[PDB]
Amino acid sequence: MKINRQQYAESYGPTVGDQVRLADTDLWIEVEKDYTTYGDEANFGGGKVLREGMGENGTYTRTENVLDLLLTNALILDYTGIYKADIGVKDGYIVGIGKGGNPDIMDGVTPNMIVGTATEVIAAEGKIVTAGGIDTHVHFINPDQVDVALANGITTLFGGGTGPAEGSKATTVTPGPWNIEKMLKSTEGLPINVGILGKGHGSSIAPIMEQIDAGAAGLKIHEDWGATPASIDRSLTVADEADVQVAIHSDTLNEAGFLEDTLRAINGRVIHSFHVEGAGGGHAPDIMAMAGHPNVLPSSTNPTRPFTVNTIDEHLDMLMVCHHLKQNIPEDVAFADSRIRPETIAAEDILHDLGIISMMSTDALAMGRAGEMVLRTWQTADKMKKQRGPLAEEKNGSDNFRAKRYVSKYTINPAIAQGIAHEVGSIEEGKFADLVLWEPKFFGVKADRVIKGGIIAYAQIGDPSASIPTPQPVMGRRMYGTVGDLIHDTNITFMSKSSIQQGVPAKLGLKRRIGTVKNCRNIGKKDMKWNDVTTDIDINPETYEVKVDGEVLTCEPVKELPMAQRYFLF
Amino acid sequence: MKINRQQYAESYGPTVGDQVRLADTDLWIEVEKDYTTYGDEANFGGGKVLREGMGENGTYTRTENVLDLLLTNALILDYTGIYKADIGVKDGYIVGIGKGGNPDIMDGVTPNMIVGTATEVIAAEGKIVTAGGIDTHVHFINPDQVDVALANGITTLFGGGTGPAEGSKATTVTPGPWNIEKMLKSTEGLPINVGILGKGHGSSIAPIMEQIDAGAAGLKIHEDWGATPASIDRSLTVADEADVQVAIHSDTLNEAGFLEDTLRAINGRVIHSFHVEGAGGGHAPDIMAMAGHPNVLPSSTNPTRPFTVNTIDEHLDMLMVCHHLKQNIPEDVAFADSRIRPETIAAEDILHDLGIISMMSTDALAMGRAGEMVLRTWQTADKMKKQRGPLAEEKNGSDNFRAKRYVSKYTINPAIAQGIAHEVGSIEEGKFADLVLWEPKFFGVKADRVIKGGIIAYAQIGDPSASIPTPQPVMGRRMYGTVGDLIHDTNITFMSKSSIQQGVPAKLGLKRRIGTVKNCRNIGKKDMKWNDVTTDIDINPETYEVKVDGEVLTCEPVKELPMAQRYFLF
Amino acid sequence: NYIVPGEYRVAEGEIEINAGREKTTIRVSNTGDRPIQVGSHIHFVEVNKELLFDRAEGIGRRLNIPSGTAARFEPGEEMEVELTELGGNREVFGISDLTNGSVDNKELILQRAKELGYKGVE
Amino acid sequence: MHLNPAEKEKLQIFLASELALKRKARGLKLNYPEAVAIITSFIMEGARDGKTVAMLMEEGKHVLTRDDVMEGVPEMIDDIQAEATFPDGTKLVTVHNPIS
Amino acid sequence: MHLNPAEKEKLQIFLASELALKRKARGLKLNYPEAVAIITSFIMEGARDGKTVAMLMEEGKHVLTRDDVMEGVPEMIDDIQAEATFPDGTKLVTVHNPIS
Amino acid sequence: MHLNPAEKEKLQIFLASELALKRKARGLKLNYPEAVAIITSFIMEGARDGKTVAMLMEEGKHVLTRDDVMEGVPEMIDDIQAEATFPDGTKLVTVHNPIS
Numbered sequence A, B: 001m002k003i004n005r006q007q008y009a010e011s012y013g014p015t016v017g018d019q020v021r022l023a024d025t026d027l028w029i030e031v032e033k034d035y036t037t038y039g040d041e042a043n044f045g046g047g048k049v050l051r052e053g054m055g056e057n058g059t060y061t062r063t064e065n066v067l068d069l070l071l072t073n074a075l076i077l078d079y080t081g082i083y084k085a086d087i088g089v090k091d092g093y094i095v096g097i098g099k100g101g102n103p104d105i106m107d108g109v110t111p112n113m114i115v116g117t118a119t120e121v122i123a124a125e126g127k128i129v130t131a132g133g134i135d136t137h138v139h140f141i142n143p144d145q146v147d148v149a150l151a152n153g154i155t156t157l158f159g160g161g162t163g164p165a166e167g168s169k170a171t172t173v174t175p176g177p178w179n180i181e182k183m184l185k186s187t188e189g190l191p192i193n194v195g196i197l198g199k200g201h202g203s204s205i206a207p208i209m210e211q212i213d214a215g216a217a218g219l220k221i222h223e224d225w226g227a228t229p230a231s232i233d234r235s236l237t238v239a240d241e242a243d244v245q246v247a248i249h250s251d252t253l254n255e256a257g258f259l260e261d262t263l264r265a266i267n268g269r270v271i272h273s274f275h276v277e278g279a280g281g282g283h284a285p286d287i288m289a290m291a292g293h294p295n296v297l298p299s300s301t302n303p304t305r306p307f308t309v310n311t312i313d314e315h316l317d318m319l320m321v322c323h324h325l326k327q328n329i330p331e332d333v334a335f336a337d338s339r340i341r342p343e344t345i346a347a348e349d350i351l352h353d354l355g356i357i358s359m360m361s362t363d364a365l366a367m368g369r370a371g372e373m374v375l376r377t378w379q380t381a382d383k384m385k386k387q388r389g390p391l392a393e394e395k396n397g398s399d400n401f402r403a404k405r406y407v408s409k410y411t412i413n414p415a416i417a418q419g420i421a422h423e424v425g426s427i428e429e430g431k432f433a434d435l436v437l438w439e440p441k442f443f444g445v446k447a448d449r450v451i452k453g454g455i456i457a458y459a460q461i462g463d464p465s466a467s468i469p470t471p472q473p474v475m476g477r478r479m480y481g482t483v484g485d486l487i488h489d490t491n492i493t494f495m496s497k498s499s500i501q502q503g504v505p506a507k508l509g510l511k512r513r514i515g516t517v518k519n520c521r522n523i524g525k526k527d528m529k530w531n532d533v534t535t536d537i538d539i540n541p542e543t544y545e546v547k548v549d550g551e552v553l554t555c556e557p558v559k560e561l562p563m564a565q566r567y568f569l570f
Numbered sequence C: 001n002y003i004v005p006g007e008y009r010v011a012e013g014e015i016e017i018n019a020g021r022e023k024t025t026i027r028v029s030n031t032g033d034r035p036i037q038v039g040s041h042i043h044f045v046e047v048n049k050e051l052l053f054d055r056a057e058g059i060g061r062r063l064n065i066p067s068g069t070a071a072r073f074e075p076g077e078e079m080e081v082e083l084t085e086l087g088g089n090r091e092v093f094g095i096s097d098l099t100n101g102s103v104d105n106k107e108l109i110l111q112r113a114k115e116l117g118y119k120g121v122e
Numbered sequence D, E, F: 001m002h003l004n005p006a007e008k009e010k011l012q013i014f015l016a017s018e019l020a021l022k023r024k025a026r027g028l029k030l031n032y033p034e035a036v037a038i039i040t041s042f043i044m045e046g047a048r049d050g051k052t053v054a055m056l057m058e059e060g061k062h063v064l065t066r067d068d069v070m071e072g073v074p075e076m077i078d079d080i081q082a083e084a085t086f087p088d089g090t091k092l093v094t095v096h097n098p099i100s
């Protein structure tokens, strides 16, 4: 029997060489390899393969190489490849990527991917499956922000705040032992993975370190608290001792120093540079030059992504109103003009495309959109393909190279930056089963099903009173993984080694899975997957023109984007 | 440098002598004093004062006089004064009212109000800050009632009920040990402070007392359970032994006695007289005479507040329909006419203004509105200013005296009445940090931010998907203080001494902060702040005309109120 | 009589900031090619190394401007500012690590300033 | 807008009333929830217009008649109650036997 | 439809704006939340029409004038902010002093 | 009114359909959620009118045509499903390929 490829892809999802459009973009991904044995594909339903004595084994107990969940026929899109496989989950972790089923009768079954009595099935045929997004620039301002993030496929929020207090509205900071404790307790009710940043400000070590011992996962240095040479230095001394990451939003005003002074304070130590382009903050006008250094892990926030015709008007005004800046005060106008620059925003699109900015993030509710990190990553990739062409490294006419470069920016790279990639950030064996299923027509726009710790937490699903789940209204809804005590097992609170050793979880009565932050201090730019470029970035102090290897980086804004008015009701 | 006053007040909030209109009323409050040092005002943001080495101290650990939270530049409106100060919070309590910042470089810093690495900031410049409202007449009928209360700045609910059972629909009663236990457990999920009233009915002590030992915070005597001489007497005997408050809704029907019989049963002991005017219940027609006695702590409920052109029509009909009263049965009509009286409702406006009724409350969902205690207190004050003029005690043309008299009615006085003013009811050092921030344009109408135990619990805030928190729709929303385990630390369950000594919290697994009810039995009318007037109130049995010091108390109803159609969508 | 909800009716008069403290006027030049904006409460001697002024005159002082405002220096701009005295204990810690103690230690402050290339140590 | 919980809920009543009015305009006899929504929204819009509680108690009995609704609906509705913000604050309106 | 949380919320604004527009059509001076709803919905419909952020910043100042609203409402509204999906994605519109 | 959970949710669909119909009336090509809302609301109003499931399966294919919607929207919508209360109780309607 042979099956033509169109019918094969309709029934089982695409196989080797087939391509799939990402939403309504111009970007095509190609299946690189397939772990199946043609004819022994797994599938579930009436008269289907995963039935007892057939594709389901009826002999083995759960302990005996049997899965808790099998995602059948997934098109994985990951830094590690774009390929077709079954994904096996057990104890909340990804345990096998390969071919699931019953070795009694099927060829090619991965030995620990047996479908048995204990196994649940999710059909992923015709879906794209990615790792959950890792957003490392979250202001905790409004709890309604969590569902917003889940609906766009984000599964881990790193940042700070105590709700809509002014410190939290400006900065990703939960300050001090008591606010940290209080927010770790609040986290017990948030259906997403979380890590909390303390205030990376002080001139003595003890006030800063005590936040790490209290359960912070990292620190945030922000100009609004004084991004001075001393605060920078002390924070990095603490981080180096504690093995956690430090994020920085530098001194825009250049008050205590220019960029070179901030770099001298850093003194070669590892740091995550937030909104490196600078519209979101940092040394005016040249902060983006940070992204050329080997010790800098550079991220963008999302409202500048990508450069569009409404971007500058929107930002100038947002900046002016948030800072109580007056249109008739020339210092306020000069400040806005020094900070919102079409020249650095345009270059930022290209720096992403070149693998010079390694990460995306949101800046949720401070100057960024909680549910648009994934969305805007792909809009950027699409704009770049249109303006720059397929990258040289591509072949078969696919956009695989660019797709891996871009998916890395919101999955594995933030996870590496933050010291949490042993748990999350990619679809690999041994990592936590945080998985997002996408219909390709909705890819990067609205997630189908979001799996947290191996149980669905969020889904686009219909009328709960209906005979079946698909009738209208189909909307994003919290699923059983969020309910009761299951919220504890499906989510991870990331904490410093020292707070864990000191028994903070037991002291606070935390029931969530506790994740350890580690291996954050001896990484650099070279460790950012597909985005590892170091170079001399020059930003002209007079014209703001950006150069890399003596070539000016200029780009046009676009009037329309994909993943926009076709999809959204507002 | 000098700054003119208009610009100073725009930047830092108002200072000494400046006045502020309360919403759209005619009421003006004047800043009496200011704790600042001009030039060293605290503020937070880009290039602002609360930065490391500047207005933020970078030396001190949290234990060392450093705050967990500083509310900068608050205009406090409280029984203790109307004044400008910074408010410092630590461990969930108000620890300092004065001037916050960094003693390294600033003059006048209150010694325990250091801004340090551990400190969060809330900007209160241009806001009015009050204590959270204390509503002592709550029927627990519908859990949706809690957000309603929080949105109008109420932070403590005292009352009873088990949901929409008829006993609870009529009376603020959780009857018996088992219903009390069940409702203490329900309370674990309610994001507001709570105290539960048992049934103040019985002819033997034991059935009543066992409710106190079970965890009730007080008792409610209600005519629907038999407000007889025996039930009154036994309840007060229990209260005197247990140190909890007794509330009364007396025998409207005069069945076992007239008012003088109820007073004889009381026998000089302390009691809280609910809806003392009597439309909400009590000896027809003269119950309001209770408010002249030294042992009576008198409260009004809110639908009679203030007297308006629709009040009588609305009440007559509400009474008739709730009691299944028939328009063609003359006994039903005579009963309604004896109970709903324009003469006592009008006098009630004036008794408030004179400091003869000490407290407001809601009667939520029984015959009162959960989200209108604060609202109606100010509408009453405004009507009285319009009809009676500034009170004699005023000066500078401000309404400070009246504002302190009125704010006391829903903050400190109910707290004193109930035995909980050691914890709540005012902005004073050593009390729980239950604080409500108001924009003056919305003062008493819609709270900006409600702080519970030092963490924001509720806020008027916008689109959670936006780049910033202010875009539409701006609506009331639960914040992080309500989420997960943080709900336990931000709220207080008030309980009897005996239930606490007997280990009820551990027996039920209560995680909330446990507050002790105490010092309720040796207070009287003289202990009601700004509302301490005792007098002979005469109510004419034939005409219902009310006299105090031989003068008839008459007042007109009004056709329009402030804090009404300008603000509400429905 | 038109009602603006929540409006102020401010008293007469003006508010004098930093009253009773010594004031000093000095000239300051931004010798760099990027703008520098300086807040009201930063110890003035510790500002950006490329601002040229008599660094001694910034010791123990900050800008005499309303709390939370800032002075801006465009690239190449020279202008005069007015300073007022620090209060409280008159100690500074952190910021640029020039002081870390009493502001009375002028020689130590200037020595560190000079060694690190803060312009205008004279 | 600063919507409070009741404002958000009550938007639902307006919406149901709009839905019901469209059903009536295309010739349907109205059902129980339709009829309740129409009369309720009429009361709250009336308060917004500045009418008195007594005027709305009268008018609410003439919004829908029996020929506008399905068999039995008049006898299912003993009264309709609504609170809204009048010029003089929130008041309760009760309309007894709105559809005779 | 695959509604996300913001889409569901923002339906509320449209609804409040419809309600407010009916109130204005029968001759009422509009209140604070009414006015905010009308201007907000106008911005989001404008984005849907494909207008620019700069066009909506201009137009939003001419949707309602002082004679359309109650005393004090113009001075209560310092600005109105809304995000919507333009042809080039979500953008923020801020309209300062919309009602003079 | 005694609204149950489904009644409350489904009010949202009507509202989205009203919004979408206004967008279409001012000349916009409709998007994915707009189109789904219009067709869904048409089905539920149809059931309310007393039409049969078979009539709505036919009619639902003629509510919107390709020139009413944006490029790609017809191919994004494989079917639309809705449950509503017919004269003979709740039934499911599925409209396959509603927009050709």
Ligand SMILES: O=S(=O)(O)c1cc(O)ccc1O
Pocket: A169, A170, A321, A322, A323, A366, B468, B469, B470
């Ligand atoms: O603090 S606010 O919530 O009012 C805010 C307003 C604004 O215009 C920009 C940012 C903000 O955080």
Ligand SMILES: O=S(=O)(O)c1cc(O)ccc1O
Pocket: A350, A387, A388, A554, A555, A556, A557
């Ligand atoms: O390739 S191009 O140099 O023409 C280019 C155009 C553009 O609009 C943005 C980036 C670019 O690299």
Ligand SMILES: O=S(=O)(O)c1cc(O)ccc1O
Pocket: B169, B170, B321, B322, B323, B366
């Ligand atoms: O018990 S009810 O919920 O039906 C009720 C109806 C009523 O007309 C007045 C009060 C009430 O508690």
Ligand SMILES: O=S(=O)(O)c1cc(O)ccc1O
Pocket: B350, B387, B388, B554, B555, B556, B557
């Ligand atoms: O002061 S008056 O005696 O004229 C008065 C009028 C009024 O309408 C209500 C209360 C009053 O005390």
Ligand code: NI
Pocket: A249, A274, A275, A280, A281
């Ligand atoms: Ni930032």
Ligand code: NI
Pocket: A137, A139, A170, A171, A172, A363, A366, A367
């Ligand atoms: Ni940020």
Ligand code: NI
Pocket: B249, B274, B275, B280, B281
């Ligand atoms: Ni009562």
Ligand code: NI
Pocket: B137, B139, B170, B171, B172, B363, B366, B367
């Ligand atoms: Ni009551």
Ligand SMILES: [O-]
Pocket: A170, A249, A274, A275, A280, A281, A363, A366, A367
């Ligand atoms: O940021």
Ligand SMILES: [O-]
Pocket: B170, B249, B274, B275, B280, B281, B363, B366, B367
């Ligand atoms: O009552």
